[PDB]
Automatic annotation (TrEMBL), chain A:
This is Putative tail fiber. The keyword Ligase does not apply. It is found in: Virion. GO terms for molecular function: carbohydrate binding; hydrolase activity, hydrolyzing O-glycosyl compounds. GO terms for biological process: biological process involved in interaction with host; carbohydrate metabolic process; viral life cycle. Keywords: Virion. One of its GO terms (cellular component) is extracellular region.
From TrEMBL, chains B, C:
It comes from the Viruses. This is Structural protein. The chain holds residues 150 to 298 of 298 of the full protein. It comes from Agrobacterium phage 7-7-1.
């Protein structure tokens, strides 16, 4: 057991850092970083935040978090994995965001960037209003919005214009509306 | 400075909306009998207009075959919206004006696809990875591709 | 970020009159009975040329539609210069028929001459001073000069 | 666009101009087809051009119209555009921007 | 191979190969011949790269039996060799 009372920041142009086995009782800012980072077995009592110019690839493993936010003009690649808390997300940047292998995820917002939802047990709700550009695309893989308990459906909403592609995405069977170019990524030859 | 005017709305006079100007006359004499042809010079010239024309419902149909000194003559009707007729000996005429041929082009622009009929431009939406062609039955269909020039 | 110039050419373009040129064949068949549609991937391509060719004077006329993977169909015939027809109680006697006019245009772009048939661009080879115009007898073959407006 | 409907007596012909400019002829520059009937008496038939459509576009303070691939300068932006076509047609006008 | 955001080129010439829960596959090729140890199975994987939005190639000429399940790929025509097995149930929607 270890307890930390403060905030931890990855300074501008930093790289090669590695952390493990800490309970951080505060934010974790990531601005001006140059990638090549790796967090493991960590907890955060507040929202991770990323701003400014970012390049490279970042990894978080078993990093429980109250929420996550990404902004700025950075163009890095944030990779998430594991965790046992209903975290929120909100990406407004030209970065690339990846999430996979999670039992739950709280509210999700998609204003910009590239978001790839993969292998999520349950999603509380989803939203998207991005616009068409070479850095923007929304793709979902093997994740359902239907909570087994209390047997309800989370909302969905896409009013933006960015393209998208759904593969094995369980949602309200009821007729609805979606805006933006669609790709029939899946294949029907094999059912 | 930053700019977006220099994009497809660039300083040019607006796309490439240009048709060979109805320039001055060069030659007009009519001939019956066997096939006849004339020649002109490219010197100080960059375009011409040809209006080969039928007269008096003669057997010969209007046609245009153009060649230079070296290259062979090109076929114009081969890329035309030709219309035939259903000439019948039946006492109850059903000689319809069946559309012999129809041609259209599909080309790409960034994340947009457009098909053009005559001079009207038909927008088709955004990229999706696939195009679809639909036609009735009993016809023959061909599809090509090439550079945008 | 940085954008490759060639990619920009896929967005910008104009100035000289331009169009597609036939360069390859991707599909071709003839079919009787029900209608029949096809699909073509947009991957690494920028233009398609499609022709609805009718053989004989059969029951059904040639027609064309177009659409993307999920877009709505567009009817090319909806915008054209169509030639109509109508028949009285005629007994089915010989008819004139045949096209009347062969009006077109020609143009040059540096190394090569060209002429625009509808929207397809027709190669005319190099420039060698000599031009040629051919048409059968009993035809009016007016010519003009021309320039790329 | 001016569409004759059915077997209208007046064929489809389109003429356009500026507010105070002369009339330019469209049908003068088209690749058409004809079907003249037989000299045999009674074998009456009717055909020709029924659909006519034209494009108008500004280039500055000038109005230019295109037929076939021929540009007919109607005139300057005098303020109004004149048109003429025969009767028994469904005259139609849309707004068409440039590409 | 399982739980990866990417993988390069894959060639299957013998033995049993299981690709499970894969983000993007650059291209898959195989030539294994049917026997008691050569089999191919794909689960929750795609040949489609979300960026720059292109379809990876596929090719299977060998006779080894196989079974696809949500193996997202091009929706165009195709051709495969060997005895396919259907595992998708088809009761949904």
């Amino acid at each position: 057991f270890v307890y930390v009372d403060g905030n931890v920041t990855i300074g501008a142009a930093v790289s090669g850092v590695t952390v493990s086995g800490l309970f951080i009782d505060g934010n974790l800012t990531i601005a001006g970083a140059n990638g090549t980072v790796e967090f493991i077995n960590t907890t955060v009592s507040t929202s991770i935040i990323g701003t400014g110019n970012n390049t490279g690839w970042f990894l978080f493993d078993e990093v429980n978090a109250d929420s996550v936010s990404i902004t700025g003009a950075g163009t890095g690649e944030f990779i998430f994995r594991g965790g046992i808390e209903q975290t929120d997300f909100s990406l407004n940047a030209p970065s690339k965001l990846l999430v996979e292998n999670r039992s739950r995820v709280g509210v999700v917002n998609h204003l910009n960037g590239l978001m790839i939802l993969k292998d999520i047990g349950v999603i509380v709700s989803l939203t998207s209003t991005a616009e068409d550009n070479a850095f923007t695309f929304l793709a979902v893989i093997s994740s359902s919005l239907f909570d087994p308990d209390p047997r309800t459906y989370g909302a969905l909403t896409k009013t933006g214009s960015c393209s998208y592609a759904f593969q094995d995405f369980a949602r309200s069977n009821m007729a609805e509306t979606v805006t933006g170019a669609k790709w029939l990524v899946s294949n029907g030859r094999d059912i | 400075a930053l700019v977006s005017l220099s994009t497809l709305r660039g300083a040019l006079g607006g796309g490439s909306i240009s048709g060979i100007i109805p320039q001055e006359v060069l030659f007009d004499q009519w001939r019956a009998g066997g096939n006849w042809e004339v020649s002109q010079s490219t010197q100080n010239r960059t375009g011409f207009i040809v209006r080969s024309l039928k007269e008096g419902i003669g057997i010969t149909v209007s046609d245009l075959f153009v060649a230079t000194g070296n290259g062979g003559y090109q076929s114009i009707s081969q890329w035309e919206a030709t219309t035939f007729l259903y000439e019948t000996d039946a006492e109850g005429t059903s000689i319809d004006g069946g559309r012999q041929q129809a041609i259209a082009i599909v080309f790409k622009r960034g994340t947009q696809w457009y098909t053009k009929s005559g001079d009207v431009i038909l927008p088709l939406g955004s990229d999706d990875g696939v195009i679809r062609f639909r036609t009735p039955g009993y016809q023959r269909l061909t599809i090509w591709s090439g550079a945008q020039l």
